[PDB]
Give the backbone structure.
Amino acid sequence: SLNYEYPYHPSGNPKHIDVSEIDNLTLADYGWSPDAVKAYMFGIVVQNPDTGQPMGDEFYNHILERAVGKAERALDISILPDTQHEMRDYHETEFNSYMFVHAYRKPILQVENLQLQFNGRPIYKYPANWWKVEHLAGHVQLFPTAATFAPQMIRLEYVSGMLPRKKAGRNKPWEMPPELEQLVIKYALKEIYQVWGNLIIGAGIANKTLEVDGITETIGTTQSAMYGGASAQILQINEDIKELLDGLRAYFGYNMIGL
Amino acid sequence: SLNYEYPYHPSGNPKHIDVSEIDNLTLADYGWSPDAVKAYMFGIVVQNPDTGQPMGDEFYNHILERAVGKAERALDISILPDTQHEMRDYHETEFNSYMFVHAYRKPILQVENLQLQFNGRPIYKYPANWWKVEHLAGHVQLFPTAATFAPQMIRLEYVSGMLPRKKAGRNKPWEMPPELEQLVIKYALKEIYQVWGNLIIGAGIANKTLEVDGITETIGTTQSAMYGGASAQILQINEDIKELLDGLRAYFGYNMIGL
Amino acid sequence: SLNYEYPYHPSGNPKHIDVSEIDNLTLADYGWSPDAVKAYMFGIVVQNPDTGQPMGDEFYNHILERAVGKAERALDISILPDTQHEMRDYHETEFNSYMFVHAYRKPILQVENLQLQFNGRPIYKYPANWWKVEHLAGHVQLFPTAATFAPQMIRLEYVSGMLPRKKAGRNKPWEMPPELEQLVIKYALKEIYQVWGNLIIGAGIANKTLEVDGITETIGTTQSAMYGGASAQILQINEDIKELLDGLRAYFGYNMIGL
Amino acid sequence: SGMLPRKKAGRNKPWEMPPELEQLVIKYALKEIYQVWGNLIIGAGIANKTLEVDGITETIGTTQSAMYGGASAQILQINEDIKELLDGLRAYFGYNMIGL
Amino acid sequence: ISLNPIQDAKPIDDIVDIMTYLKNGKVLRVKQDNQGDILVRMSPGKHKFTEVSRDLDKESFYYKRHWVLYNVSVNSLITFDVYLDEEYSETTKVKYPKDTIVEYTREDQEKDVAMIKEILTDNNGNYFYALIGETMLFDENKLNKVKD
Amino acid sequence: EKPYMIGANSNPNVINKSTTYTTTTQADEQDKPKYTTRLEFDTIDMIR
């Protein structure tokens, strides 16, 4: 005997998240707070040159929401926890392969429903114990126990995202690795530095020197006719991302589809 | 006759660590204290120019935690000790080959359970003496004594990571090499130098000269429109890592999978 | 007749080291002392710029332990004396070849035990005189006198390392060559120069000149926006290593495995 | 195994150390020395300087540079000599062959 | 559910005790108003003299404190408040130390003045203050220090 | 064990900060040094 919620079987598709908690989980749980960005800019402050206004936290939150999205497309991933309503077609070769299915999004924390439909009406519902999931790769397969294709023959509902990691320096396949936490931070700093680069001195100024009654003040800056003030840091950031992003890709691997 | 904890057979899969001690092991045990990073920066201190306030070890540990993850992805390895609950599929060709298995994460310190199940009911649990492991390569094979594939037929539980090195200048395959200590530290320095380079003098400043009442000073800094102040150290660190990582990749070798 | 400890036969596998002395042998016996590093930096002293603190010997010992390890991976070697517990698989082609075996580590100073096991239990033990060793290449072969493969059919225990060389300008194959002693030194200087390079003047400073009441002091340094202060020595060190390392590789030769 | 010290001037037997190895080893030692000696010529990490006090001034421009060391010139020449010396000497011994 | 009381570093007021510690060889720590915070030690061995260092930290295995001779002055010791190294530390940089007089808000919406007599911190680092004439403990944000 | 996270800021605001004036005193002090390179003439060459 075994005790479990009927949709969730500990073997195959163990539960990982409560559906109600999906809304609650947010950026701060993953450490993507404005404080994190500012810490990476320790000693540096972004401020208006003509007045003492600093840029608000909302701007950082505004940037952070886009940075994750850009990373969410740079890697074909669904990172934040969300629920999906998926219809998938029937194909003979995949159906005979234990009903192999490749989710549009990944990873799959857990699967809620799995049904076959006809004329838009569900006609069959498999036992919960039958079907099993592969979280990281997003594969879903059916393991029954005791023309060639059609459109939207089946319905799938599942949760996609990554849990905020529980322990240091480790992560389960259904759990967020540290790199993704850092990668989104790095993306954001690219936009921050762009804005900040124009504020160090005036606008489009490279060389300056004053002379007053024998007193002279002189400054030369990183701003140049061909490079921006923050281009150096941007260049280093891109260098870090190229190594980091490529290394992270191996964690997921290349896509593939039959034909 | 032989005396041993039943899961742990001294021949084949000798015990190396207790399950409870996993939670105890941390970064400091491996030598990744903030002191080590500061030692590599001997004679150099980073401070916020608007204060007399340096940064705390919280930032350093945050860097180190992300840094060890970075090396954890540069190589397809799990480094810190952790337990794993793996469901693996049945493939005929490897099944006949002494039930050959390659684990998701490596190295394997020890194996606790190895069972074959159908629908959550263990069909067959093997004797402890039969199964053997290959720690570094992560290979698991069986030595019994007196369609072509299916999903998640077997269930595996084991521990993944490396132990802190015990003896000086020596290491076992189940033991953290000293190199990973240096590689992770070097990764942390890359993040630090990005911060430290900006704070050496002002921000966005390359050249300056000031003259008052007969006393004058002129300075030309490493900061430039095309390169950052710390770019020199980053270049050297990248050079060292490339040699260090490529050579270390020989210790683990390439990854292969059939089809 | 002949007198010898049973495991050690003067012909084939002569004894070279006492097992008890393994722990005693250390870095100083091989000349890898901090004094050696400082001698290679004759006239140069590493010191904090703001206070008169020199870096301690432990830092050099900390560096030296990693430098040997990096060399221990740059060449697939076990250099320090240590004892190994090795299980190896059975393969038909190698078994018929006088039971050819290629050790994971090399060189092999001496072999302690060699047994065939079944079900995790040893069942046979060859006579000591039968088996013979090839120290440098690490080959072990059996020379008896008067499916196709299985996993971990045999057990091997042997000592791996290199003796501290007894005489000047010479070394036995089981004895440390002078080059390895120098190579580890060269690796360490790479890390020392990195730290020292930031201490010559300030931080990220290239050009300076003062002027006070007609007195002026002016300095230009090796530090530059694109190169570090010690990059020149680092470059020369790399040049020395490339010739030295490649020449040392010929002493060991390329690896090979059948298939 | 080894070679004897050379007995007669400008002559050598196959079992006798050629004079070249004497020079080659010496040249290798100079490479290590010049690495040390280059750093100590003036201060450390210094390339250019000028000092002026009370009407007396001095200015110096050294071989030390951000891209090359002070002794790099000698190392370059030594490397050039060794390359000719070693490659030519490799003819005296020839390539290595083994059957299979 | 809090950490035990944390003690403040006592400045040494009398010269005689300071010399006595110095003769024994126990390290002193002096703050100079103009230049810096320094350690003071009398040399080990028979070659006796005063030594000064600026390596302000506990002697870790990886942090070797370095000493140089200096002719320390008596007046420097007298005028500048001096501490023993074993007490002065980052372990407590409390905003209002012990024996400090503060103005604190009472329940009756009256601001009374009281002296801090005991100090302890919760696990979260917030310092709890015991005040004369009051039973419970007080929080840093509630307090006000009146200077001069 | 638990992951290291940056957390929130802690520095409180300060308004109307007064500059620091060095205090006059007859007592002794120690001048904090800087250890670095030094410039000198080549007096031997000057003789030449």
